[PDB]
Every structure is written in C-alpha cells, then in structure tokens.
Design an enzyme around this catalytic site. Structure first.
Site, PDB file in Angstrom:
ATOM      1  N   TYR A  61      49.196 120.478  87.652  1.00  0.00           N
ATOM      2  CA  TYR A  61      49.283 121.644  88.653  1.00  0.00           C
ATOM      3  C   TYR A  61      49.933 121.525  89.664  1.00  0.00           C
ATOM      4  CZ  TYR A  61      45.014 122.617  86.115  1.00  0.00           C
ATOM      5  OH  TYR A  61      44.196 122.848  85.318  1.00  0.00           O
ATOM      6  N   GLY A  87      53.414 122.441  90.977  1.00  0.00           N
ATOM      7  CA  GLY A  87      54.638 123.410  90.863  1.00  0.00           C
ATOM      8  C   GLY A  87      53.863 124.664  90.186  1.00  0.00           C
ATOM      9  N   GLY A 120      51.323 125.889  87.366  1.00  0.00           N
ATOM     10  CA  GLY A 120      50.572 125.104  86.410  1.00  0.00           C
ATOM     11  C   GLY A 120      49.209 125.913  86.158  1.00  0.00           C
ATOM     12  N   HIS A 157      44.868 122.712  95.847  1.00  0.00           N
ATOM     13  CA  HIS A 157      45.466 123.740  96.552  1.00  0.00           C
ATOM     14  C   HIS A 157      45.728 125.044  95.775  1.00  0.00           C
ATOM     15  CE1 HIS A 157      49.484 124.980  98.278  1.00  0.00           C
ATOM     16  NE2 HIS A 157      48.701 125.057  99.031  1.00  0.00           N
ATOM     17  N   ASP A 158      45.771 124.827  94.241  1.00  0.00           N
ATOM     18  CA  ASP A 158      45.862 126.256  93.684  1.00  0.00           C
ATOM     19  C   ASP A 158      44.354 127.097  93.823  1.00  0.00           C
ATOM     20  OD1 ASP A 158      48.364 125.596  92.636  1.00  0.00           O
ATOM     21  OD2 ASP A 158      47.554 124.633  90.882  1.00  0.00           O
ATOM     22  N   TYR A 182      44.173 128.785  97.073  1.00  0.00           N
ATOM     23  CA  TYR A 182      44.916 130.065  97.273  1.00  0.00           C
ATOM     24  C   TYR A 182      44.113 131.175  96.317  1.00  0.00           C
ATOM     25  CZ  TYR A 182      49.159 128.360  98.993  1.00  0.00           C
ATOM     26  OH  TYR A 182      50.446 127.757  99.984  1.00  0.00           O
ATOM     27  N   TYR A 241      53.216 131.627 108.613  1.00  0.00           N
ATOM     28  CA  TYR A 241      52.165 131.422 109.418  1.00  0.00           C
ATOM     29  C   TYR A 241      52.968 130.575 110.502  1.00  0.00           C
ATOM     30  CZ  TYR A 241      51.547 127.252 106.378  1.00  0.00           C
ATOM     31  OH  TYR A 241      51.929 126.258 105.685  1.00  0.00           O
ATOM     32  N   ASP A 258      47.244 124.815 102.938  1.00  0.00           N
ATOM     33  CA  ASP A 258      48.645 124.381 102.874  1.00  0.00           C
ATOM     34  C   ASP A 258      48.197 122.915 103.780  1.00  0.00           C
ATOM     35  OD1 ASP A 258      49.712 126.229 101.527  1.00  0.00           O
ATOM     36  OD2 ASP A 258      51.178 126.677 102.929  1.00  0.00           O
TER      37      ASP A 258
HETATM   38  C1  LIG Z   1      57.946 123.603  98.934  1.00  0.00           C
HETATM   39  C2  LIG Z   1      56.863 124.157  98.123  1.00  0.00           C
HETATM   40  C3  LIG Z   1      55.974 123.229  96.888  1.00  0.00           C
HETATM   41  C4  LIG Z   1      54.652 124.144  96.709  1.00  0.00           C
HETATM   42  C5  LIG Z   1      54.187 124.405  95.312  1.00  0.00           C
HETATM   43  C6  LIG Z   1      53.203 125.390  95.423  1.00  0.00           C
HETATM   44  O1  LIG Z   1      52.232 125.485  96.096  1.00  0.00           O
HETATM   45  N1  LIG Z   1      53.431 126.713  94.890  1.00  0.00           N
HETATM   46  C7  LIG Z   1      52.645 128.198  94.847  1.00  0.00           C
HETATM   47  C8  LIG Z   1      51.170 128.111  94.533  1.00  0.00           C
HETATM   48  C9  LIG Z   1      50.626 129.348  94.290  1.00  0.00           C
HETATM   49  C10 LIG Z   1      51.269 130.477  94.820  1.00  0.00           C
HETATM   50  C11 LIG Z   1      52.606 130.510  94.899  1.00  0.00           C
HETATM   51  C12 LIG Z   1      53.378 129.164  94.994  1.00  0.00           C
HETATM   52  N2  LIG Z   1      54.711 126.274  94.157  1.00  0.00           N
HETATM   53  C13 LIG Z   1      55.516 127.231  93.083  1.00  0.00           C
HETATM   54  C14 LIG Z   1      56.605 127.965  93.772  1.00  0.00           C
HETATM   55  C15 LIG Z   1      57.591 128.578  93.076  1.00  0.00           C
HETATM   56  C16 LIG Z   1      56.979 129.025  91.848  1.00  0.00           C
HETATM   57  O2  LIG Z   1      58.004 129.978  91.134  1.00  0.00           O
HETATM   58  C17 LIG Z   1      55.902 128.414  91.153  1.00  0.00           C
HETATM   59  C18 LIG Z   1      55.130 127.719  91.802  1.00  0.00           C
HETATM   60  C19 LIG Z   1      54.892 125.120  94.379  1.00  0.00           C
HETATM   61  O3  LIG Z   1      56.066 124.485  93.998  1.00  0.00           O
END
Ligand SMILES: CCCC[C@H]1C(=O)N(c2ccccc2)N(c2ccc(O)cc2)C1=O
Length: 121
Positions: A27, A29, A31, A47-48, A51, A64, A89
C-alpha cells in the site's frame, strides 16, 4: 498535496518519502490489493482509506497549511477538504514515526504478485 506530505514525512522520520515510502509493501505508493505486509504498510493502508473518505477532494494537488508547535503537527484552517487532507497526512506521518523500528528494506520495490488479498477499509 504530495509536496507537503513529503516534507511532513521527512521532518518526522528523517527518511525521504520518495524512495522510502513510494514503493513499499502493498500500500505504500500506488496500491489497491493484498494484505499489508507490516505496520508501516498498514500506515499506508489506513492513509489510503482516509483519502477514500474524501471522494470530492483532491489530496495530490490541494495544498494545505500546517505548523509545528514544538514538534506537534497542527493543521491550520483552510477549506473543508484541505483540513481533512491535512489530518489524514498528519496521522500517516505519526504512524510512520511510531513504526520506524520495524521498517524493512526487504519490502522496498515489493512485487505486485505477492499482494494477494481482501482488506476492506
Ligand atoms: C511524498 C509522498 C508519499 C505519498 C504516497 C501517497 O500518499 N500517495 C497518494 C495516495 C492517494 C492519492 C494520491 C497520492 N502516493 C502516490 C503518488 C503518486 C502516484 O502516481 C501514485 C501514488 C505516494 O507515494
């Protein structure tokens, strides 16, 4: 936005978000499948999900404002979305900090096929 979350992560863990948490486990990056590999991966899962509770917000690009009150992260007043994104975050950054002791390099660049499973938010 991603830029601030990245700075929040760096300030909190001393690790660059991009290596360390952009391709970790299932998860961290990008996932959307499998069972989180460890505590850190679980931080990304939650975290996912966080969001996911904000369908009409845009976490990547919406910026923000936050300040450090003697180490504590304090989200400053902005739009409803900005406030909620910041809280998501902040939680992730703290979660990463609390689990730095179990962070493992063997989960970096983790293969997609090893992420098999169903875990609902
Ligand atoms: C410095 C940041 C680390 C954050 C991590 C995150 O929360 N998201 C993330 C999660 C949900 C929506 C948008 C971004 N992505 C992510 C970034 C680019 C990408 O094309 C795919 C996934 C991440 O790498």
């Amino acid at each position: 936005s991603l830029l601030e979350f990245g700075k929040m992560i760096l300030e909190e863990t001393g690790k660059l978000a991009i290596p360390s948490y952009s391709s970790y486990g299932c998860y961290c990056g990008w996932g959307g499948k499998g069972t989180p590999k460890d505590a850190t991966d679980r931080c990304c899962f939650v975290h996912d999900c966080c969001y996911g509770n904000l369908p009409d917000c845009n976490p990547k690009s919406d910026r923000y404002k936050y300040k450090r009150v003697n180490g504590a992260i304090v989200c400053e007043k902005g739009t409803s979305c900005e406030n909620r994104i910041c809280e998501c975050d902040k939680a992730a950054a703290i979660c990463f900090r609390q689990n730095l002791n179990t962070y493992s390099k063997k989960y970096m660049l983790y293969p997609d096929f090893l992420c098999k499973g169903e875990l609902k938010c």
